[PDB]
């Protein structure tokens, strides 16, 4: 139905032409077929360009009668079932994403929507009847889109819905929890994890001082187990931001966070181990001394294992802790507790590591433990092979023990 | 008497590995020990006599290596010459490298395995072979055995005094083959120098020595290739190290040929693989092949988490 | 000190517990993995009263040792006192059924389902059933999704009073707010409905199944339609039309492609489990719609079921249904754009030949087989060549030679070697059915040309094909036709083609007989024993070992022994090894 432009019509017929244009934009074209209906796609693209920009400034064109039409328009355009993906894994630096092809229309529709919620005349008490729980359920389903441009637009749209409608905030967070729990414990197949973590990063940034037990359960039971999935390289920065923000708001939550990061420490993925070390440096950068001491023993047992790892990347990332001055200061305060944890590890890697760079770094770390807290060092190198005989006789004791256990069962 | 029973042991190991069944840690350790014993007597320029089938990168694609054996023939019936890059990126690096080392030990004169840029401790640790050993063996002993054995792999190979086979490319610190024979390869691949360049260099349309985008090695032009060939009496330089969509690629006016034997590289690139058969009188034949038809897809199970060890 | 007979031991338990909750992860993990030798060294009394309460209260460490302990306690029925004391294992395992990690709670529910039969009805209603109520009423989703798998193992052996309690408890588990446990409930829907009485599978299982089949998330609708197969296996053909069919009609034309793919993938399963008349009424238009679907995966799944669906129709209407409603969609599917659809259809299409009839497959099916034979994609080509024996049995061998033999001769030298391999593997049937005259005139050239193929697998296939052709035509025809060219290959300047002669002699000595293999093949091997390439030499040794049992001792001692002795003195090590081994196996040295 060839309709004219809104600038070529009077102000009386302006709202009814606006509504009619949205009705025409409820028609979906086939972009997988490149040559089909070429002229009418250009008509809808130009018509979408008229619809956007028009809604930007305060003008009163957003009457209540336009609310259901614009909701139905964007619902007919973006809401759909995503096609199957020929891939099961994704490599950011090598693998390439599959585009949606209807973007020359979807982008404008998304741009129309993100500006409709951002409109100066937008009223949420009226729009909540149409942007309901069923609408956002489909919207969060759209987050599995393989197109990163669509995922970025859905990021901003979901942030706008969360900020405008406060009655949906509990439902939004619960649905993201459902998405994250299925992504972790069932099927690892979700492309919008990084965007959802950015949304949550802003939400956690805007939390209350009396932190609800619901959000503490959200951090412990959902955010921490998210560290286990293999695709952690796709959202390590956003997850680290959410963890650091939770600790910046409640430093008392640093105990369940540390225990979680070491309960899920990477044992078969070295790049994941380096990411854990990089994230842990951030947690230790925003740590408090009274909270550090509470977990300093099992923590430094882990870094003692990390500095003693034969993986040069993990060893470098763990030995670079001794270059950060603040976490150095915490070592200087509790050296009599963590130096015996590190000593045997550093002296072993001072002899058994293959990388000459790593054996030079552990020498520098040992020189630090000698310049500071010397008496600890002297009475530990004096009780070196004495303790090494103790552990060696303990091992053969366990071995002959298990030999006798197998002798009794026979 | 012990040699015959170890021959039976090696045949059993090869039969087990031929169906993607890894060996034990002690088996791998003994195999690596005797492979060191064998490889220590080999020069940096390995004298190989024709006929032989030159293969490029494999990169842990075990079933694609089975396809390679289907194409070129089974060893020891068909003589082979691999040019490095056996592990990493593939899903079955352990099985592939173990099968190749076992075939080298069992059949000394039948195949010759060279060193690639991925037979280093650093590269195996960054690209996931060390992680694979961690999953399949529980500790880092097997990775240590294999990385210690990698120091014994010959740098280059000389087929019939004419074909110069090597993983990477030429080096500005290398003039004659005697310079290569003089190097001490019994060490981890350095970050620069003749040994590092021979495993990291690449050919290029850019004339003269250039800067390699990989970080290590150099980029040489056709003039350098033909100068090296006329100075060393070689008719062709066979190399790998680089992906080829066709499987094999001529360059520098038939002075250098790149051979890539990993079809559908990393299960994404969708490339053909190829091998170069050299007959009894050096008549080149290039066999291209697609990836092997992978088996049926069983019901995907919940994988063991990475914090399980 | 030791005991009179009782498993009770004076073994220090401290040195045992100093390894379970002590040391690093690997040592205690090995101790938990071996937590069975320590249970025998402690004794049933001490295991039940000193090691099980230990493991009950030690909520410690990561999930790996927890998984190991669950798997271990799955087999601890006898180590605690038998079916009398199994109830002491239920507490620890219960804690393992609430673990967050999926593998731990899954191994826990597995161990629970294993020892569920070890209880008596009293122990079930007194210990296990309360454990089920506790797990399925937890605050976190893990406990509920793990408890969803405990109903089928304790439902039939309990009283008729806790039946309604457990039924409504499972219903509450179905109407849960979190989709995580809703998915598990939809999965175990059928597993729990099979152990339910008929009066309960139609009054409470059908509404639950319909509700799950109309849920907001397709992720659970697909499991609902999956469990539909097990559910419809219980209602008679009179109730289905009112209880299972309304959900099926909407699941066939559903908005999500995933539940439609589940419908198409379990289409013939439904056809068999639900009835034949209704498939004539209901499922035929559903099949027509699924094969004409907008999604390509659904079209491939539907085309995969074409054969087994068509041959499972009612006997009387089949000839009309497939010809008037199924065949047009098949004609449309051969010209599809997606290659997976075409390949999946070609993998089953020829099975329609005996169902249609010789004239019907000639007029309607043969052009489609030809088109799929000339297809650009190699997978559809291989799949359509795979099932040629069926067509050859339905139509005539002469008709197959008229229509499809040129295409087979063309594919004999296809670009992809596996198509050539399929042609080679179909060569013996064609030879045996066409006769030695037609074969020697037409198809002999291809079989002899495959012997010098670039791919070694094709040469191996041709080597085996030579033996099969001999088995078809006779050792006399073998000596007349095959042997001269095989021996002529001994002069090839390529050792790869030269070893094919030895491989052919090896595969042909089994069928040509002592006389033929002594007068024609043995001289060639004995001459090849001096080949310059060491590969050919050790293959000569191996071939002599292979053909040995076919000659008489005079020939082994007079002509084979000196050759093997001279090969044992060669410069190469492998030829020496193989010659010595041949001497040992043939019993000559
Ligand atoms: Mn390389
Ligand atoms: Mn490579």
Author numbering:
A (entry chain B): 46 to 455
B (entry chain C): 1 to 309
C (entry chain A): 1 to 589
Authors' own words:
PP2A is an essential serine/threonine phosphatase that regulates various cellular processes, including cell growth, division, and differentiation. PP2A is a modular multi-subunit enzyme: One scaffold subunit (A) binds to a catalytic subunit (C) to form a core AC heterodimer, which together with one of many regulatory (B) subunits forms the active trimeric enzyme. The precise regulation and assembly of PP2A remains still a subject of active research, and conflicting findings have been reported regarding the role of carboxy-terminal PP2A C-subunit methylation.
Interestingly our X-ray crystal structure overlayed well with an Alphafold2Multimer (AF2M) model of the PP2A trimer. The Aα and Cα subunits formed a previously described complex. The B56ε B-subunit forms an arc-like protein consisting of 20 alpha helices. The B-subunit makes extensive contacts with the A-subunit (interface area of 1384 Å2), an interaction which is largely based on the charge complementarity of a negatively charged A-subunit and a positively charged B-subunit. Notably, the structure of the C-terminus of the B56ε-subunit includes an over 25 amino acid long alpha helix stabilized by the connection to the N-terminus of the A-subunit. The B-subunit interacts with the C-subunit with a large 1294 Å2 interface. Given the recent successes with the prediction of complexes with novel multi-subunit structure prediction methods, we asked whether AF2M would be able to recapitulate the experimentally observed ternary complex. Interestingly not only did our X-ray crystal structure superimpose well with an AF2M model of the PP2A trimer (RMSD: 1.047 Å), but also all the key features of the interface including the >25 amino acid long B-subunit helix were predicted. Concentration-dependent assembly of functional trimers was observed.
